[PDB]
Amino acid sequence: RPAFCLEPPYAGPGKARIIRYFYNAAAGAAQAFVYGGVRAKRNNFASAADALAACAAA
Numbered sequence: 001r002p003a004f005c006l007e008p009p010y011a012g013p014g015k016a017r018i019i020r021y022f023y024n025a026a027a028g029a030a031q032a033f034v035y036g037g038v039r040a041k042r043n044n045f046a047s048a049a050d051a052l053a054a055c056a057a058a
Contacts, residue, residue: 001025004042005055014038021045023055 001023009022014036022043024031030048045051 001055001057002042007041007043009033009043010035010039010041012036012039021048021051023051025055028056 005023006025007022009020009031011034016035016037018035018037020033020035020040021030022033022045023029030045030051035044043051043055045054
């Protein structure tokens with residue numbers, strides 16, 4: 001998988017309240033988190049399906 005799939009979720013310093021998904025490699029699962037709108041890192045997707053497409057494919 002890409003190295004970014006191993007990153008913890010990054011809410012960032014922003015005040016937005018946006019439901020997003022990260023790949024939880026420890027769990028081997030997609031998981032929801034609250035994203036602030038600013039400075040997103042790579043492990044940050046609109047749906048569980050995009051997170052898994054990216055991080056659990058092949």
